[PDB]
Design a protein around this ligand. Structure first.
Ligand code: OZB
Ligand code: OZB
Lengths: 306, 306
């Protein structure tokens, strides 16, 4: 029993983290086989933050200008190139700790763990969601860029995020591992702001299922709803529309608890319209939306990784 | 910016996790040098859960009866003994991934990360506190016992917890790595219940400091309080007494923000007496008490580990 914001074990990613330095600027890189991936704004100067000419800045760098360290060991750079907003530094040594891996582009509403790093060393690990507005609510300071987000499946690490930017109100933006930003953001110091965020309805439902599995059942009412009538209420409270695919993805939790998804929607409808009246669910006073249906099953069934 | 429930990187502990099986029962063990540590109730039978005769059960086991697997590799057991509530299985192979480590007994109110494991493989990592009533609010299923809690300092893993029991209401009890339980609990299936818990006042204050550091300042009032008058209010709301040592431990955060601890106590006093009126702090609708002052500094200053 119990339900926690749970991150993936980070060891496989820890073995890939390195430090990349250009002049005064150090950030993190991801070392897979003989390539180090890092944000291209490592090549930025104190002056041209507002609109860096990245191609001109990279033209003027040589391999030797990139100082890459794995622990206390310098990795010699033998090639460099830029792919969208990431640099790829070819090094002369393949990373012997390289896990089985994939580069994936996740969808809004999906979750992943972040291994927050500084100077190529890990600070901590936490779970995040890709918000509907393509930000993440992370915890990042100066020097954290190049920290990555990831999922694990059996033995395979799917890298999905690399950290680049902090936006107004303290939320975060970054790229996939092909260097393409999530959302409309750019790697320059210019007026950007996130679009308004919305609540990830399918995740709130999954978390209500987790509550029922843990014996926290007070909010279940005796009613049902149609999918259309629920979505009319979701809309007023800034919740994402619930789709049939969402309903089908909730199948396993619905089957385990014996609660039809649309019956759970009726209970969520009542919570939205009426509030929680000072009560908590799974120890929370707000409805939580950063657990996917898959996260709930993994945590409540004890799925492991090798 | 940002503030997350952040766990330690788990890689150093992942390299120590093994599976221990006696007959039908499998749980996790911790492999350090040539010793595997695990809960002694691995030797329990389907029948004598209510009050196992552990000494008689262990007398009847031989080395070969303990099946210890590291990944897919059997570790041959060459010695066994019992220390309080843990078994120590000597194996013929020292763990080449053994980190620098210590066994520590933590105090109530301190925090640590749990690497939840099943069949010797990791499921996830999350941050916990040792509650004033010597329980932890974990997330554990059948087969999780032997999972450990830990802190890291530079390169040194301090193991502080090993999981043994789930208590009524879904909270958890366990031992230090010398096999001594935290709290009045015993490893048998008998009526035990936690004493009433209380809120960890020094941690709530630390988390209010983290809020100020992140620009979430609405709850700061213009008043101060004496330590005695604050503690009279803390008592009514089931908060731990705040001690001078707690005040001094909050020194670094107080100095960083320029807010005297007793001034923060006045603001906390107002929150306790008046509620939050539907507002949130650091995205939370309840006051959070599972971040220590040290956790706040580590997260907000980007402290890393090797
Ligand atoms: C005002 C900033 C927060 C400094 C800035 N944001 C914007 O300009 C916006 F348009 C989004 C709002 C921003 O993030 N920048 C500036 C550049 C780099 C990058 C950066 O500092 N990225 C850090 C890495 N390392 C991680 C940041 C630091 C604080 N916490 C984080 O997460 S963009 C390339 C040229 S300099
Ligand atoms: C009712 C139980 C939850 C089964 C029981 N609790 C009590 O009897 C209490 F007095 C505390 C309330 C309990 O925890 N037991 C029973 C024994 C083993 C141990 C156990 O199952 N420990 C698991 C490990 N592995 C981890 C548990 C399983 C569920 N979630 C967890 O965290 S004690 C040694 C003889 S059998």
């Amino acid at each position: 029993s119990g339900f926690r914001k749970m991150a993936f074990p980070s060891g496989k990613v820890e073995g890939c983290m390195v430090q990349v330095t250009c002049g005064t600027t150090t950030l993190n890189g991801l070392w897979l086989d003989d390539v180090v991936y890092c944000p291209r704004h490592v090549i930025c100067t104190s002056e041209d933050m507002l609109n860096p000419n990245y191609e001109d800045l990279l033209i003027r760098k040589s391999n030797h200008n990139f100082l890459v360290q794995a622990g206390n060991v310098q990795l010699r750079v033998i090639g460099h190139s830029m792919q969208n907003c990431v640099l790829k530094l070819k090094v002369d040594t393949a990373n012997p700790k390289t896990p089985k891996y994939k580069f994936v582009r996740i969808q809004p509403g999906q979750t992943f763990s972040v291994l927050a790093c500084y100077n190529g060393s890990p600070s901590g690990v936490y779970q995040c969601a890709m918000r509907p507005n393509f930000t993440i609510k992370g915890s990042f300071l100066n020097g954290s860029c190049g920290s990555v987000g990831f999922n694990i499946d059996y033995d395979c690490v799917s890298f999905c995020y690399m950290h680049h930017m902090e936006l107004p109100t303290g939320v975060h933006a970054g790229t996939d591992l092909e260097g393409n930003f999530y959302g409309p953001f750019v790697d320059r110091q210019t007026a950007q702001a996130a679009g308004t965020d919305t609540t990830i309805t399918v995740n709130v439902l999954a978390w209500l299922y987790a509550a029922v599995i843990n014996g926290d059942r007070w909010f279940l009412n005796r009613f049902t709803t149609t999918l259309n009538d629920f979505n009319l209420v979701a809309m007023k409270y800034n919740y994402e529309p619930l789709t049939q695919d969402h309903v089908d993805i909730l199948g396993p939790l619905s089957a385990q608890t014996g609660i039809a998804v649309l019956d759970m929607c009726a209970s969520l409808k009542e919570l939205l319209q009426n509030g929680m009246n000072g009560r908590t669910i799974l120890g929370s006073a707000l409805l939580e939306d950063e657990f996917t249906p898959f996260d709930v099953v993994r945590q409540c069934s004890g799925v492991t990784f090798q």
